[PDB]
Amino acid sequence: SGFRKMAFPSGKVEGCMVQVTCGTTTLNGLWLDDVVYCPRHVICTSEDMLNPNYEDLLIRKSNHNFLVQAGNVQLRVIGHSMQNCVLKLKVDTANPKTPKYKFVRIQPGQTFSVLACYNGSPSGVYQCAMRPNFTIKGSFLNGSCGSVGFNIDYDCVSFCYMHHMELPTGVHAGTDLEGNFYGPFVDRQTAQAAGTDTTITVNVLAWLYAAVINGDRWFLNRFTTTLNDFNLVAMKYNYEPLTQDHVDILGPLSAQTGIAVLDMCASLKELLQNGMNGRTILGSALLEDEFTPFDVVRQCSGVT
């Protein structure tokens, strides 16, 4: 029993973290096979970051300008290229610790683990979600850029995030491993405001199921609702509209607890309308939305 915000074990990703230095900017890179992936703003002077022309800035850089260090050993750079907002540095040595891996672009509402790194050294690991506004709520200081987000399916690491920037509101923007930003964000120091941070309804419902499975039940009521009725309440409280797709995904949690999805929706509706009246759910005083239905099943069934 017990339900915790849980990150994937980070060992497989720890083995991929390196330090990348171009001029006097040091950040993190991801070493997979004979390629090191890092944010392209590694080539910038803070001066450059107001309106950088990355193609023009990169022309001034040679393979020998990219200093790549895996622990205390230097990697020899034999090629470099820009793909969207990331640099691919070809090195002469395949990373012997390369796990089985994929590059995936996640949808908003999907969760992943971040391995926060500084100078190619891991500091810690925490669980995040791609917000509906395409930001993440991370923990990233200067030097953390090039830290990556990932999911693990048994033996295969799916990399989904590379950290690139902090908005003035203290939230985080980055790319997939093809260097495409999540949302409308650019690697430029400019006016970039996040949109509405809407709540991930399907995740809150997943987490209500997790609560019931672990003995927190005070919020179950005698009520039911419809998708259309519930969605009127979701609109009012800046919750994502719930779809039949979301209901279908909650099917297994429904089946295990014997609580119909629309009944749990009615519980969530009362919680939205009435708040928690100073009570808690799985040690939280707000509705948690960074567990997916897949996350709740995984943790509740002890998958490795």
Ligand X SMILES: *CC(=O)N1CCN(Cc2ccc(Br)s2)CC1
C-alpha to C-alpha distance for 50 and 70, rounded to whole angstroms: 31
| Contacts (CB under 6 A) with ligand X, residues 27-86 | 27, 41, 44-46, 49
**Judged by CB under 8 A, which of 50, 78, 102, 170 binds a copy of itself?**
170
Least distance in angstroms from the C-beta of 140 to a copy of itself: 6
145 lies in the site for ligand X, by CB under 6 A = yes
145 is catalytic: yes
Buried b (16+ CB within 10 A) or exposed e, 55-67: eebeeeeeeeebe
| Contacts (CB under 8 A) with a copy of itself, residues 206-225 | 214-215
* Residue 303 interaction partner, one of a copy of itself, ligand X, none, beta carbon < 5-8 Å per kind: a copy of itself
Least distance in angstroms from the C-beta of 9 to ligand X: 18
Give Cα 214 to chain centroid, integer Å: 26
Question: Residue 97: is it exposed, middle or buried by C-beta count within 10 angstroms (0-12/13-18/19+)?
Answer: middle
CB count within 10 Å of CB 301 equals: 9
Dihedral sign (CA 98, 100, 105, 110): negative
Q: Closer CB to a copy of itself, residue 81 or residue 169?
A: 169
Closest residue by Cα to residue 272 from 213, 214, 212, 225? 225
Q: What are phi and psi of 96, to 5 degrees?
A: -65, -20
* Residue 131 interaction partner, one of a copy of itself, ligand X, none, beta carbon < 5-8 Å per kind: none
* Residue 214 interaction partner, one of ligand X, a copy of itself, none, beta carbon < 5-8 Å per kind: a copy of itself
Active site positions, annotated: 41, 145
Contact positions toward a copy of itself, by CB under 8 A? 1-12, 14-15, 115-119, 121-126, 137-144, 166, 170-172, 214-215, 275, 278, 280, 283-286, 298-304
